[PDB]
Design a protein around this ligand. Sequence first.
Ligand SMILES: NC(=O)c1ccc[n+]([C@@H]2O[C@H](COP(=O)([O-])OP(=O)(O)OC[C@H]3O[C@@H](n4cnc5c(N)ncnc54)[C@H](O)[C@@H]3O)[C@@H](O)[C@H]2O)c1
Lengths: 506, 491, 487, 517
Amino acid sequence: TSVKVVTDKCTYKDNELLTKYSYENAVVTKTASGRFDVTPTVQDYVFKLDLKKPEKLGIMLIGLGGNNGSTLVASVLANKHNVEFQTKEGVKQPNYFGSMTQCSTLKLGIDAEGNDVYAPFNSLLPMVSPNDFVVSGWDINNADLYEAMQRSQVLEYDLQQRLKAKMSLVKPLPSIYYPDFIAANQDERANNCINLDEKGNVTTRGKWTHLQRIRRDIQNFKEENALDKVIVLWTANTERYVEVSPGVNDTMENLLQSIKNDHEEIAPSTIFAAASILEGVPYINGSPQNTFVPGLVQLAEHEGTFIAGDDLKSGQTKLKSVLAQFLVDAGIKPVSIASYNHLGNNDGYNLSIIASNDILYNDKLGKKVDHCIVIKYMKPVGDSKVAMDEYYSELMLGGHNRISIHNVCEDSLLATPLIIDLLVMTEFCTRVSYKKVDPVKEDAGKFENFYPVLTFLSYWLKAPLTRPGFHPVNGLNKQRTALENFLRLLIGLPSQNELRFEERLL
Amino acid sequence: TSVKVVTDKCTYKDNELLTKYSYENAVVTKTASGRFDVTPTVQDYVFKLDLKKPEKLGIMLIGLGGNNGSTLVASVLANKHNVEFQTKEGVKQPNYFGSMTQCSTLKLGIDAEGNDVYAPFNSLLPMVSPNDFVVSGWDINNADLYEAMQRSQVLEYDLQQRLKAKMSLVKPLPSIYYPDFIAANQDERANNCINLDEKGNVTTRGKWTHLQRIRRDIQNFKEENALDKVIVLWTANTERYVEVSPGVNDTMENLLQSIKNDHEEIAPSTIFAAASILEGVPYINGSPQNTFVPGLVQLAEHEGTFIAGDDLKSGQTKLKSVLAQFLVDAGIKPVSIASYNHLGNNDSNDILYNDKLGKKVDHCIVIKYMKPVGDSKVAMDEYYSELMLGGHNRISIHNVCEDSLLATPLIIDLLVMTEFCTRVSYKKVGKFENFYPVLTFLSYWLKAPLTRPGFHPVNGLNKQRTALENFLRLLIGLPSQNELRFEERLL
Amino acid sequence: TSVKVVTDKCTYKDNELLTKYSYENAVVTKTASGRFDVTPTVQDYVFKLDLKKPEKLGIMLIGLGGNNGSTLVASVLANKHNVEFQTKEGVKQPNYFGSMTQCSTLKLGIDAEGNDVYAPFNSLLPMVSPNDFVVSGWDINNADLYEAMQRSQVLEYDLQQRLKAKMSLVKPLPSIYYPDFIAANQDERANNCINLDEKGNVTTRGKWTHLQRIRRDIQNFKEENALDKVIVLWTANTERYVEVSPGVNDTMENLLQSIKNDHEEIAPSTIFAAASILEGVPYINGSPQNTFVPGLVQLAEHEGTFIAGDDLKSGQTKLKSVLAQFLVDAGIKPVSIASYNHLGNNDGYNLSIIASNDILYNDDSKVAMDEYYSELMLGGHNRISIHNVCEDSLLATPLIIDLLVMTEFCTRVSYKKVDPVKEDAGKFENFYPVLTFLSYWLKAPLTRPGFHPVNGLNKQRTALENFLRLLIGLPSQNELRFEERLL
Amino acid sequence: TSVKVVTDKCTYKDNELLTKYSYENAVVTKTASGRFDVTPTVQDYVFKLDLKKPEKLGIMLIGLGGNNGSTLVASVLANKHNVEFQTKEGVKQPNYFGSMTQCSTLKLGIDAEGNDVYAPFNSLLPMVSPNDFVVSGWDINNADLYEAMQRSQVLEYDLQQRLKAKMSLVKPLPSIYYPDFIAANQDERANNCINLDEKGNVTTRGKWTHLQRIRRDIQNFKEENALDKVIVLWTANTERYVEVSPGVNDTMENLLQSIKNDHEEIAPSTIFAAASILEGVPYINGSPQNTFVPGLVQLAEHEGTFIAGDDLKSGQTKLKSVLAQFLVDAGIKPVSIASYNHLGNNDGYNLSAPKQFRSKEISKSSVIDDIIASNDILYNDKLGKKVDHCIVIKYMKPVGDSKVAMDEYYSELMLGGHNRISIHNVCEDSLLATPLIIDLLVMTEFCTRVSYKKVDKFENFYPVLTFLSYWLKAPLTRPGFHPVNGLNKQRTALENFLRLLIGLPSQNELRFEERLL
Ligand SMILES: NC(=O)c1ccc[n+]([C@@H]2O[C@H](COP(=O)([O-])OP(=O)(O)OC[C@H]3O[C@@H](n4cnc5c(N)ncnc54)[C@H](O)[C@@H]3O)[C@@H](O)[C@H]2O)c1
């Protein structure tokens, strides 16, 4: 499918789309007798979109041999090659269910009877297909992707067998292993490392050489596959937070020298992110550690390359967000949120809204929500994960409400389509540039790319890497709306209002 | 708290607010190929909002002596008189928790730092407070509201006692009882009926006479309380649906005639609705039965009076909505929805669903009666969806709570919004007009939203709230929410 | 694997075992003044057990092509030939998990240090192994068992494939199809029926010829397999209950006559039951219908054959029973019990303790959920919810195996009720045709005219355990452990 | 109601029931060939029961001002004085629901129809009623019991108001406070202590005088209420396990000496235990801590005084055990059990500290091992003797005494199938523990009036009344004996004890009058 809007806001020229958009917002000021003084603001923009998308997109994953990496490669091959497979429920055709860019829809408007008309999320503007991903990456373990699948226990046995021949040919590149950064148990899995000494052992020495090695890898992968575009994504084991100290990783220059100095606060991801930036390739952090120290963020700004992330947002987390928001929107006051969960995969083994509502949360009836988060490792559960979150909330006149959400599913089958989403949306953003219109000075403007931090990806990240003078904004619903309204405006359509006046009125 | 927006779209002349609004949408078409041709549309309006709100809002509940009815009255009194009460957790202050109009907020914009600023949902435009509701109504049982509270077993004992003296003085008016629409359990309890014979017995004969008595009741309630603004809401036992047959209830003329004929397709609710429409007061159906037959809806357009309803949307039905919506918007394909919910009281994506992959979704709906639990009912909903490459996802939603403690603030929300909507009229760009008789704006609070023919009902809980949010916003010269945050995303 | 008890209560003949047992119980009589008068009682018995079990045991399932039937044959074959299979979790070995007789243990006593010593349930006495089951049966649909496995969607794909060659060889015999007894949504699949009229169409007439055909089927099955013993179990779609009518199915002669006269109330299962009894073959009803009408019960008593049943007991039913029991034993008063269910097998498609406690009570992947609301002291409350997810065929199959193993065992046991004042004499008698020892696995136990069908799961396993114990000279379990407490 | 059993086994003298009983069992040995050699064993006994129980039983609770303590007192008063109270569900009558001794029944036999006949658990032999309980006790906090109720938020507001007058007069005695033994966040509460120095500040010096004070406390409570029988029960904050060392607490000699030396391995519970033993009064340990150190156990033996305890088995745990039993007896192999739960009382707030949590963590995994142990068919080196288990107990103040417990089992079925069972449990935890406390006291009293003698001079049960393991999560046993956690087997041992004493044999369930005949 394809979409064509009749608008005077858009002009297509030589695989290039120019769109006018007037951004409206409002600045508020509450004071005195509690009066909210709101002053609307307007800012006109011109968006430019390279309509020409990569025929093939290179993807390089750190942790390629794990559950997510294994599964991501399997899904691209299975789908690209229409690899149907046998299950106890019969033959099945591959798909990308769980992917918003591949399997969700957006409301374009209404037809003749006044009913909504939805179109595929990726049918509005040109987006790259996961079927066109050319995937590679690094892993401290040398097992090929077929062996990786076997070890992960995520995919149907018969699907692994039909993909055996191809997955066996995929081997992860050696990686950077600095033992002290991951969960104890690891020196055994690590058997494919570049950072070796004269005798071929450990070594956290030569971090800048490691950095160079990684940059060569990116250059090699790019040329050997005749790839113009490449994106890097960390989906490896969570590392132990790095301390942010002045003079070391506080600035571009400082960080860069610290790496050269083989400093203790220079983790493997730090080098991967730095190497990607230096190569000009977008870098996404799918783990919770804080690799985006202030010195790295400056580097990206300096280089003018995109970065994003900090922990892939799990399904349970999303649901929690949606659920908590719903209660509050309805004026329900949650007092506690007991969250629990346990899995038996390597991820867990390694791991082995009050502000918006002062009516409910204030200094008279309570401003806090007692909530605990427990994550246990239960090996016999496998990739399958069991999450349970309970909400005990206050209702009117001394009443209470207890809601329990139980969730069971193979974690990696949820994570892989989200990785696909992060990759497709990241590529899409790279082809987007803009320029703010100066009311007074007609021209002179020059297009620019988004701020080096792609917050448009917050939908898929648990802890959004916040830009300096602003606070992170989660709220899953608010996050999809933004993405939806962005595609909309690029094609000359206004944000969704839900007013349906062609029904409520006259 | 108040909100003052600096805009040139908002006018003011004699306690009136005039706001200009350009409504944008887009008509879509599809072709041989999946080619979607979108043609944006526009229509400018001028909305007029009467800022003079009633000092007192009359509320008339059919089923005033039930769980929702008695609880509604107790919440108005407790809050209005700040009746704090004792609980084994300590003395508690009354509130309207569970009420969107009373306890939720709206984002007005950002502050100097770039942070979102939230204001009370009811602080944007003048809205009536439930503390100013004057409540009465009808019930087939003569028990006063103190006796009703005891029967309902909804509220804290101590609160019931501190409210005893006031609730004991509230007696529901006699109502219309047509046994063949509920009966049995609510059969015996019927000792407050107007439809009696000369021998003093319940009769379904003299219906039009029943209509006249209800219109009168409405009139007397206004007079005795010095109110001119009244809203009627159905929160009584569910009735057996009726048949919409031609010549009977297909037109207002036929409808009115059928009532005179003592027709059997004329339920008590048909009579309460009709009498309210005739009295020109808004009527809301908090039950699932098909009250608004075409004849009634016709009569309401003609009289130009608000009608809205069809079942108070319960909490679990709201969770389910938000839940399913979440999944589909994530590219996840729900398959099963084995839903269940027993109580012990008296009461869009063809990518996943298409021909090839299948557009079928088996939905299970169970409701059992088990009195032991009392008002505190328990709901359980289970979803089984398909993930990529043969995997599945199983989500269970368990909910426990006193049903009426969630229904009451929802009734409050409906009444508060219905009143707000009566002070609103618009004009396209002629004289002004009022919303179409069927207030679909209140869909957020009703399971089976009554809609205009040709239109499909949209039940997405979040979209319904968005509509309301955007309505209040536009009335004060604010654009819908874009969530683009370009001051944060763009250099 | 074996157990030897040093005791003078047991004598071993050729292939016989004779065990003396003194049975104690008590009769109680509560006087109006509320007093309980308890008169202890004792009744001595002599049990005889034929130790020579069948080398091969014939099994004939009605509904052989269903989820339970196809899964049963698959389990026997996989375990018998040690067919390991592939899964996401790696290579798995076949087993009989979920089977009490095959995978549970019993406490024999204590060791030197006073510690409990457990032995396999099936090691106390000789019991037939499900690996020695020779299976056949009937089904109104003729798909071979490989196709049945595909249709059921119960087993691991790789296992189905490894079992393909062998399961393909098993085809269910034609069955008796009286459409007026099922849920209708089983009419399209019926293409394997013996009850066909002149024009070859499905008829409800000639029921006596149908019954003789089933007897032919049983005799043939034995003969062709050189089988000595066979058991018949009904694990087919649930039938519509039949109303017991005087002069119709109230007695043996009546029943038999109503069959010859193609009467309305003779269900296909009635004929299967009757044919089995007439062939001296035990018969087990795994469905809820009241197949065992008075007439059938009498025909069985006269024939000296076994009958048992009324609905294979589900895992959630077993669970509820233990839970409710637990609460009542703790003095808690359950006032609410909301049970729920929804499976993924053709079982559902066709689907479309208060007397003990006078103190508190006075004047294929199925998903089950049960919630209990009980009142605690001083007005408090307790809310317990049991959520259960599993492929019920994987639970039913081992339950069917236990039923067949226990039924076979009981057929090798006979007794003599000893008379004190009448030494010697009294030829050994077989259990009462109705086997209440199998109550453990059946949701609605079949019982005698004046007795109440016990459902306490815990008690049902205790009865079975103590039975095996007494047959080898061991007393019942007291749990007194005076080895400690007293000293 | 009462039971009368016609049997030449019972000699009902002048308030002295004498009963003959032959206890059968068997000793097993397993040959390398795989054969079990079982040899039956019998032992005749004579049981003597003092039919004359006390008209009033003295109950002294350590932790009297807590959730359980105040709730127990409230239940006794409400029931004894038939104090009905109001609730949103109407006026209710007080009762002892949740109490096995007051609300469960036992099968006596059958009627003339072959049907089961049940009678009240307490109708067989005389037992003391909780209405005759005379309660007092200690607490490091001086709040009277009405304030203790308000603070616990366990009972109906109206019920508390009705009991306000009488409970305001109940004040706990000063107790012994050794700070380095409790959670931590409790020292602000410690305002009722006996162990105070010259300035009047806590101190761990003089543990023997402390010992002497508790003994006298017992003696005073007894005479002030004209009581003859008293039972002490620990229902206070869980203490940290104590370190049992040689020459300090390995022998009663050492233990008493260590106390006189204010030794640091001598906890407050250790002292209440010793004091109770020296006064000849039964001592029940309701917490998980290892109070009953070997030397203390020795003392109980030498003095001939009953002791019993270690964890007040939450109903949730009892339930988990039953289910795991049902599964293994069904041939189903659990390969994982995830326990979880959060509560907002002082119990949970205390268990926060990992040193106290450890005590509770133990006596949770114990069961799983016995179950794995009983079935070598499912659990062995070949298939795996593995069964994953985790116990998570979070403190969530917003829920109060209402504890929410969730337990999930993942078992393997045949041919690679699996089964997932979830148990969700919610209730006022103290409303389950209180009636449980009542059972332990009634059954302890009952056991004190029971003596025996092996025949072919009477004695008393071994100090450790393992007979009470049904209500104890951490069964306390002997040297060479493993604990029996099978909840079902624990009640049957009780049913069979009572039956036996009245001439009835153990239940067999054979029902030969229905199966045979
Ligand atoms: N799996 C899920 O369901 C899930 C859900 C939400 C978030 N996450 C996130 O994604 C991450 C990966 O999850 P997973 O299931 O794929 O993990 P996994 O343990 O199966 O795989 C991680 C892989 O990282 C490799 N690795 C570790 N350190 C490395 C290094 N320095 N260089 C290269 N390779 C290295 C390991 O060898 C392993 O193959 C987690 O750490 C977490 O941040 C995972």
